[PDB]
Swiss-Prot record, chain A:
GO terms for molecular function: GTP binding; GTPase activity; RNA binding; U3 snoRNA binding. GO terms for biological process: endonucleolytic cleavage of tricistronic rRNA transcript (SSU-rRNA, 5.8S rRNA, LSU-rRNA); maturation of SSU-rRNA from tricistronic rRNA transcript (SSU-rRNA, 5.8S rRNA, LSU-rRNA). The gene is TSR1. Keywords: Nucleus, Ribosome biogenesis. SMART domains: AARP2CN, DUF663. This is Pre-rRNA-processing protein TSR1 homolog.
UniProtKB/Swiss-Prot annotation, chain B:
It comes from Homo sapiens. It is found in: Cytoplasm, Cytosol; Cytoplasm; Rough endoplasmic reticulum; Nucleus, Nucleolus. Belongs to the universal ribosomal protein uS12 family. The chain holds residues 73 to 142 of 143 of the full protein. Changing F48I: In BTDD; decreases hydroxylation of the protein; decreases the accuracy of translation; decreases levels of incorporation of the mutant protein into polysomes; patient cells become highly sensitive to oxidative stress. Component of the 40S small ribosomal subunit. Part of the small subunit (SSU) processome, composed of more than 70 proteins and the RNA chaperone small nucleolar RNA (snoRNA) U3. The gene is RPS23. This is Small ribosomal subunit protein uS12.
Length: 615, 70
RNA sequence: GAAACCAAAGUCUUUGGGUUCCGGGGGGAGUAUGGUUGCAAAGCUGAAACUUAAAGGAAUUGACGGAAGGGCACCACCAGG
RNA sequence: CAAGACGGACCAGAGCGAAAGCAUUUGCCAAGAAUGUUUUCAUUAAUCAAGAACGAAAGUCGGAGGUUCGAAGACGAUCAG
RNA sequence: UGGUGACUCUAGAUAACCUCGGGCCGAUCGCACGCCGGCGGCGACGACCCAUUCGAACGUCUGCCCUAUCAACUUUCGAUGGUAGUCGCCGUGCCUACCAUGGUGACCACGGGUGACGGGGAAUCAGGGUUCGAUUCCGGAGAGGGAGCCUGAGAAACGGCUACCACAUCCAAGGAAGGCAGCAGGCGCGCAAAUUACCCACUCCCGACCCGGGGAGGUAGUGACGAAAAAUAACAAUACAGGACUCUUUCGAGGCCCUGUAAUUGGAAUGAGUCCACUUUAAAUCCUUUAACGAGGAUCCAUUGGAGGGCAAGUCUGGUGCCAGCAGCCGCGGUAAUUCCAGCUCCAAUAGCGUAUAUUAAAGUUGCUGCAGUUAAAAAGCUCGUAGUUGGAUCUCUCUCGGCCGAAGCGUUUACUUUGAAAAAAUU
RNA sequence: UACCUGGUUGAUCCUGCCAGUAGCAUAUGCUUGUCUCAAAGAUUAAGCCAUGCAUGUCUAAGUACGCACGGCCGGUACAGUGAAACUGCGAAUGGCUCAUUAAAUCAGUUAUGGUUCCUUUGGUCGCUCGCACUUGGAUAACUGUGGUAAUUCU
């Protein structure tokens, strides 16, 4: 490039460009045009009382909103030219923390001085890492509640206790109002993490919610979700999803006056009939017994880890009947399988994409590179919803918040979701393949019966009958369609409504063509050995059983590969050819493959979790 | 794709079963492979290896010591 | 001297008579670009990106000849029984 | 009879020339090494960036002449290809 | 008059000049007060000038990295010199006017580049050398970019001013205000770097000053950058296992033999910790010193890399089966895997140890010491030829001025060697 | 401690590079009980900066009429301490960074006989032949009236 001025001027140009990008990013929050900065406060340890820090932090002009249980307020300061919205959460109550930490702009964690944090807070923090961190900001409370002598070593011990979970952060303390000024200054200017799962749709937080019942006996009426738009330009025709209560149609948007402007009734849109998105999720045209079962599950998992899929052939039931729908494959990787060969009535009830990647690109470019005529971000708007149950307002009076987000096109239909997911080491309870588990798949909450498979690059995926503690699996189930990326969480009712976390991951591409193959290997003990010829017993029990499964190729735990020549006895006595000679301590085994499909167990309603505790 | 200039680089995930930790569009800390620009061992024309993912080392994730956020 | 070989290719770890040009693992490549000479073809100077663990030099045997000779045997042949 | 060509055998482990190269007789032209010198000058020398003459064959510009041979180009044989 | 090595020096004489935007020749304060109406001691501020100190400023000789795909550069608009001037604190093309046509270059000028602030110095290293030096000491430069100023002895000053440029703060929309390459802190950039702490007590500096001020500086906080010391156990008896010695044909038996291993037994001795008191200190903290509690290994428990060769330590057991993977290189995996993954055992370093990159020694693979050029990479096709480099033998102290000596010339000039004095501290 | 080892081949002897070996410096991983030193936004961006601080100053000795004070003794010009303001000096030292800059900076060496110099220290301070037993006019401090949304504005 030469000519030192030329290199310098090119560098100055690039500097200008990246500074313009950064400045264009940072005005989107906490300002005259920006929406308020939502800060969610979690006291991790049980010794901390959030009211103490909450009143140290509340002083600036305050506006104390109130709810049934939680207490969140609005803060406005022209000194820092900053609008804050502080909302408090309790650890263990994973409902509230999970469904309102996915819209909060910055999370402030409180830590006791003596210990790191509570085990319940440890569970909460594990779940929050697994679903996505907006911005964490470490804080402590009891540092100045001790003399200096133990104070410095207390900070040292906390710094020791944090580096195992948070890799490196400074611990910013809260004891005085001036320290709260330092913290507020810190939270005003942070390297904001763009959690793209928030940004790609039009998500809105509700400050007011009013129910106008059309008919009180029908227990359904018009809802007034008024608050701030925080994602994209929100459009009426796109449907609206409430995080705990499903996706449904919204009828009207108005824009009233904002409650808290930084420097101190008209309707925006009604939904046209033809341009509306239609609510069509499917195609229109068509005590000690539990302990004993748990021990049986333990024995089954122990049997299905040292032996992969060894199934003993029953001598009562005929073998070609019990494995009627199975087929044999020469090689798992290379042998073709038709994805449209055998389909039930369930895949005649979902929606398929001709090309997912093209559709995802088109939808994302239509969101980003195009502008719609809806209300812009930062606006204090009100949404009138035609169809909603009453009880959500009751929940709005309980203490849980309401968050409503406008969906992408084709996000309400049913499809076959595939979730890349690995087991959390905190839980060790054996989970079978077709169990009913709760998915938190990115603002959605539902029980499902998934199917676990390997996460390889090939076409066929062998079904996993149990969840492995290190291998990363793919959970496949009928589910409402969601566009990746998406944080995915797996929970189970342990006892008394305690949601236990098992596994977490991301959402992979959604398609029904990803077939899952269930395998069964049948064992046989070779009791006669010639050179490259063997006579094997106890694999079948009839005579026509060997004749039915003639073309299937036998393999061997010691690596030999063969194919059967003839049946000899009336019982299961079987002549087999081989590449080489078997050892005397050897077993032959034959692979049988079938296509397996997930169960249709989907329901959007979820029970409210109780506060989590350790056994 | 590097942050600082925008070039396109192929990087080798070191240990067995660790590619699943790397998820699509994540921050990765990438090093050299060890021959100073010369392609190393089996992998042809690939001369870099990933050391950290989302500011957690792959060695800790493979040894099951730390947990990967997102 | 690696040896083939060399009275110089000797007087070289016992390393210094004077001086000129020139090589630095193999490819890319005597390529592109630039300058210059040329009517033109071309010449002189001449990179890099990327790529490989070898590429190469002397001598020694022969698995094998689709190379040729002999020599052996009523479990081979001639004369026969 | 004419046309252009080439100077075999003599021709060598010979000869000369800075190398490329140089073979029919005769004359002219100016060179050139070695040898011989009790000649003369007396350090005038070795190698050389820059710079300069020569440089096989093939090729390229202007003419002449074209015997042989001959790039290109034209025939005929040879076949599962 | 006096002096330098040398004056157009210093001093002296004469004739004059001495700026109104001017040059000095005390219209000042304090302390004690005292002697023949008048005379006075000590100190502080001041002052034209001289000398000095602290410097600054220009010059002198020598000494920079890579590049010829940079060979001619300079001079109209000063390039090199001459005379007179202008400005300047001065010497000068520093600028102007008039002349002259010069000045530099293969001993590499001029142009470029530099991931260039220079040096003291750092790392390595037999000898030679190679690489680095932003960085606490010295010298330089700049306070977002350029420019121009005020005041002052000293500034082209930016914790001063005025403008334009680029950013950017408060507005009542009339205007006002900027400058963290100072200390802490933020954003941003990134692979990459700490507290919006405490104090002038130390070190020194500034002022009118035995008193005030000091993010200079000190002190704590973060700190596995790097460096030094140094715990994680010691002894005895048993109980086995081996090894030698003696007695026994051997098997076996003993020792005031040896060597190991023991969640074996016994006692003693301790520090990490919790805590008093003192000391430390500006007030603290830490280290150091005392009381009190504080240790049986089945914890007050050591890690990080490795066990195919290079390269120390397993052809041990199970799992996966040319898959997953390992492996810097050579290579392994296709079923008894010596290499993958675990366990056990073991090795290496040890409160440290892996990886990536840069650079150094190994590299006599950059060769001055000290490489190579028939065939491995390489001698120009050949000769002439300038700069460059190199080059046969030869040759063994005195005359004047002053007290045997001091002054004066030396001797064609250098290279070389040896001595001497000058050469910053820190680092070595 | 002037050192080498594996890798071309059927095998050898070579040239030759690649790889190993040790350092030293930055980053980073994993682990970390004692104790003494101790580097630390240089590299990328001499990019941008919210807020606080970083430069002030009085002796017997320039100017005291702020009762601001305890306080003289009273017509005692001014008893003392002394905020503020004028005056004088400093603010050009220090700190910070390395962008510029290649005979430039810088280093050793010489020079100013070609110059400037606060301060400190020693000299010079009736050499001058021409109201002083004390000269003039303001202006802050303070009193009082204000402007502007706003300033260390006035």
């Amino acid at each position: 490039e030469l000519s030192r001025v030329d290199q310098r001027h090119r560098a100055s140009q690039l500097r200008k460009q990246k500074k313009e990008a950064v400045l264009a990013e940072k005005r989107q929050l906490g300002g005259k045009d920006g929406p308020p900065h939502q800060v969610l406060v979690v006291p991790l340890h049980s010794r901390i009382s959030l009211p103490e820090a909450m009143q140290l932090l509340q002083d600036g002009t305050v506006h104390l909103n109130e709810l049934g249980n939680t207490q969140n307020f609005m803060l406005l300061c022209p000194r820092l030219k900053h609008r804050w919205f502080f909302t408090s959460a309790r650890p263990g109550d994973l409902h509230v923390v999970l469904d309102m930490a996915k819209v909060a702009d910055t999370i402030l964690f409180l830590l006791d001085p003596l210990e790191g944090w509570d085990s319940t807070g440890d569970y909460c923090l594990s779940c929050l890492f697994a679903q996505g961190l907006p911005t964490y900001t470490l804080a402590v409370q009891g540092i100045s509640g001790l003399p200096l002598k133990k104070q410095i070593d207390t900070r040292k011990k906390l710094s020791k206790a944090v580096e195992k979970r948070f890799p490196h952060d400074k611990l910013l303390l809260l004891d005085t109002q001036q320290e709260a000024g330092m913290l507020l200054r810190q939270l005003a200017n942070q390297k904001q993490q763009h959690l793209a799962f928030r940004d790609r749709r039009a998500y809105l937080f509700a400050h007011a919610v009013d129910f106008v019942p059309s008919e009180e006996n029908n227990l359904v009426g018009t809802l007034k979700i008024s608050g701030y738009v925080r994602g994209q330009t929100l459009n009426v025709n796109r449907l609206l999803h409430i995080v705990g209560y499903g996706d449904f149609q919204m009828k009207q948007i108005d824009a009233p006056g904002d409650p808290f402007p930084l420097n101190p009734k008209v309707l925006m849109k009604a939904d046209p009939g033809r341009q509306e998105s239609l609510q069509a999720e499917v195609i229109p045209d068509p005590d000690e017994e539990a302990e004993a079962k748990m021990l049986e599950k333990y024995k089954q998992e122990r049997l299905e880890e040292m032996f992969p899929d060894e199934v003993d052939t029953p001598r009562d039931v005929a073998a070609r009947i019990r494995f009627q729908k199975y087929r044999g494959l020469k090689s798992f990787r290379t042998s073709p399988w038709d994805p449209k060969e055998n389909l039930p009535q369930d895949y005649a009830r979902i929606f398929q994409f001709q090309n997912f990647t093209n559709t995802r690109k088109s939808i994302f470019k239509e969101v980003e590179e195009k502008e719609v005529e809806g209300a812009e971000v930062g606006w204090y708007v009100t949404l009138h919803v035609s169809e909603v149950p009453v009880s959500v307002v009751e929940c709005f009076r309980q203490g849980t918040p309401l968050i409503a987000f406008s969906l992408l096109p084709h996000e309400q239909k049913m499809s076959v979701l595939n979730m890349v997911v690995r087991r959390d080491p905190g839980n060790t309870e054996p989970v079978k393949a077709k169990e009913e588990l709760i998915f938190h798949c990115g603002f959605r909450r539902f029980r499902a019966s998934p199917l676990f498979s390997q996460h390889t690059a090939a076409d066929k995926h062998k079904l996993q009958r149990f969840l492995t503690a290190d291998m990363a699996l793919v959970a496949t189930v009928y589910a409402p369609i969601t566009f990746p990326p998406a944080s995915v969480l797996l929970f189970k009712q342990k006892s008394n409504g305690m949601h236990s976390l098992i596994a977490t991951g991301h959402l992979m591409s959604v398609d029904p063509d990803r077939m899952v193959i269930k395998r069964v290997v049948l064992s046989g003990h070779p009791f006669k050995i010639f050179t490259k010829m063997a006579v094997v017993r106890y694999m079948f029990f009839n005579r026509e059983d060997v004749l039915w499964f003639k073309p299937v190729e036998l393999r061997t735990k010691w690596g030999r590969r063969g194919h059967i020549k003839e049946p000899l006895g009336t019982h299961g006595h079987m002549k087999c050819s081989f590449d080489g000679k078997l050892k005397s301590q050897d077993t032959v085994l034959m692979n049988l493959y079938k296509r397996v499909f997930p169960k249709w167990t989907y329901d959007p309603y979820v029970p409210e979790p109780v506060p989590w505790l350790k056994s | 794709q590097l942050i600082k200039n925008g070039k396109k680089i192929t990087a080798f995930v070191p240990n067995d079963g660790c590619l699943n930790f790397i998820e699509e569009n994540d921050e990765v800390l990438v090093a050299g492979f060890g021959r100073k620009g010369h392609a190393v061992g089996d992998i042809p024309g690939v001369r870099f290896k990933v050391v950290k993912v989302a500011n957690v080392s792959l060695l800790a994730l493979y040894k099951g010591k730390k947990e990967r956020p997102r």
